[PDB]
Amino acid sequence: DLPRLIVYFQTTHDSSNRPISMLPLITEKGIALTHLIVCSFHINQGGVVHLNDFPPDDPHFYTLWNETITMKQAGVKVMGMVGGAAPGSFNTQTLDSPDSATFEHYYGQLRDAIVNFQLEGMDLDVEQPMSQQGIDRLIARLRADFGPDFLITLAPVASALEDSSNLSGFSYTALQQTQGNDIDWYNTQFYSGFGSMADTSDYDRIVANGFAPAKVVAGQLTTPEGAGWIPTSSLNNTIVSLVSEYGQIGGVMGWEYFNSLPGGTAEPWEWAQIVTVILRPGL
Ligand SMILES: *[C@@H]1O[C@H](CO)[C@@H](O)[C@H](O)[C@H]1NC(C)=O
Ligand SMILES: *[C@@H]1O[C@H](CO)[C@@H](O)[C@H](O)[C@H]1NC(C)=O
Ligand SMILES: [Zn+2]
Ligand SMILES: [Zn+2]
Ligand SMILES: [Zn+2]
Ligand SMILES: [Zn+2]
Ligand SMILES: [Zn+2]
Ligand SMILES: [Zn+2]
Ligand SMILES: [Zn+2]
C-alpha cells in the first residue's frame, strides 16, 4: 500500500547508553509508518555479523528485538539493512567473493541473521564498489531462499539511477533489468550531493530512466547533519507535484530516527507525523 513511510533506525542507544524506544512511531498520534529498517548490519571477514558495534544477539539489543514484535503487531514491516558507511560487507573478501565457499560462509551468516531475528526484509545499502555478478547473485539467492514476499530493497544514491554518480560500482539499470522483479523498491538517497527533493526534476529524470514511481522511495535526511537536507515544507511541495503526475509515489524514507527534526532527540517521532501529513493528508 503506497505511499510507504520508511524510517532507518541505526542509533539504538542514547548518550547515556540507554535504549532508544522505537515504539513512539506506533503510539504517538497521526503516524502511518509502513517499514522500520534496523541497521547497520556488518559482514566481517573472519568474524560474525554485527549490528553496529555488537553481534545482534548481544544483550545490548534485548530491548530492540523485544520492541520489534510490538511494531509488527501494529502492522509495521520490520527489515534489516546491511552495508551503509562501514566498508567490508560487499567486497571480494565477503559477499563479492569469487571463492564459492567464502561466499556461502558469509551469505549463510546473513541468511541466519534474517531467520534468527525474524526480519521481514533486507535492504542492501551498497556504499562501496561491488561487481555486477556479486549483487545479482546476492539478490537472486535471497529471493530463492526467502520466497517472493520477503522484502528486498537497495539504497542507490539518486544520481545512480540517472546514469551518473554512484557509490555501488555496479549498474542499477542493469540490475533493474535482470533482478528488477526481485527488488521491491529503491530507498533513493536524495542527499549528500547526489540528488534533491527541492523540485521534481531529479525524481522525474529517474522515472524517465526506467525506474517506476512505485519503486522510487524519496530518501531524506531527517536533520541538517549532512549535505542536502531540505525543510519538510519543501519536500511537501515537491511531493504534491509528483503525485499530480504519477498518482502514487513509492513514498519517503528518513535517515535516521533518533534525532529527527523538528522534535529532535526529545521528540524524534514528530518527523514521521509531519511526513504522514504529507503522504496521507486525508488520514
Ligand atoms: C527480550 O528480552 C529478554 C531479556 O529481558 C531476552 O531474554 C529475550 O531474548 C528478548 N527477546 C528477543 C526477541 O530478543
Ligand atoms: C503541502 O502543500 C500544499 C500546497 O501548497 C498545501 O496546501 C499543504 O498545506 C501542504 N501540506 C503540508 C502537510 O504541509
Ligand atoms: Zn564484536
Ligand atoms: Zn549511508
Ligand atoms: Zn547512505
Ligand atoms: Zn505473495
Ligand atoms: Zn529473479
Ligand atoms: Zn539512461
Ligand atoms: Zn514537540
Numbering used by the authors: 5 to 287
What does the paper say about this structure?
Endo-N-acetyl-β-D-glucosaminidases (ENGases, EC.3.2.1.96) hydrolyze the β-1,4 linkage in the chitobiose core of N-linked glycans and are thus capable of releasing entire glycans from glycoproteins leaving one N-acetylglucosamine residue on the substrate. The active site of the family 18 glycoside hydrolases contains two conserved acidic residues at the end of β-strand 4, corresponding to D129 and E131 in Endo T. The glutamic acid has been identified as the proton donor, and the aspartic acid has been assigned a secondary role, stabilizing the intermediate in a substrate-assisted hydrolysis mechanism in which the carbonyl oxygen group of the C2-acetamido of the leaving N-acetyl-D-glucosamine (GlcNAc) acts as the nucleophile. In this study, the 1.3 Å crystal structure is described as the first fungal representative in GH family 18 with endo-N-acetyl-β-D-glucosaminidase activity, Endo T from H. jecorina. The mannosyl glycoprotein endo-N-acetyl-β-D-glucosaminidase (Endo T, HjEng18A) is shown to be responsible for the microheterogeneity observed for Hypocrea jecorina cellulases and hemicellulases.
The final Endo T structure model, based on the 1.3 Å high resolution native dataset, contains 2237 non-hydrogen atoms belonging to one protein molecule consisting of 283 amino acid residues, two N-acetylglucosamine residues, seven zinc ions and 434 water molecules and 3 acetate molecules. Although 46 amino acids are missing at the C-terminus of the protein, the overall fold of Endo T is a complete (β/α)8-TIM barrel. Seven zinc atoms have been modeled in the structure model of Endo T, six of which are located at the surface of the molecule. The seventh zinc atom is bound deep in the active site of the enzyme in a pocket formed by the catalytic residues. This zinc atom has dual conformations in the structure model and it is coordinated by the two catalytic residues. The Endo T structure also shows two single GlcNAc residues bound at two of the predicted N-glycosylation sites of the enzyme, N70 and N240 respectively. In Endo T, the conserved tyrosine Y195 is present in an almost identical position and a zinc atom is found bound at the exact same position where the reducing GlcNAc molecule is found in the Endo F3 structure. The β3α3 loop is relatively long in all compared structures and is located next to the catalytic acids. This loop shows a lot of structural variation among the five structures: Endo F3 has an α-turn in this loop, Endo H, Endo F1 and Endo BT have a much shorter loop, while in Endo T this loop is highly structured and actively takes part in building up the active site of the enzyme. The overall comparison of the five structures shows that Endo T possesses a slightly deeper and narrower substrate-binding cleft than the other enzymes.
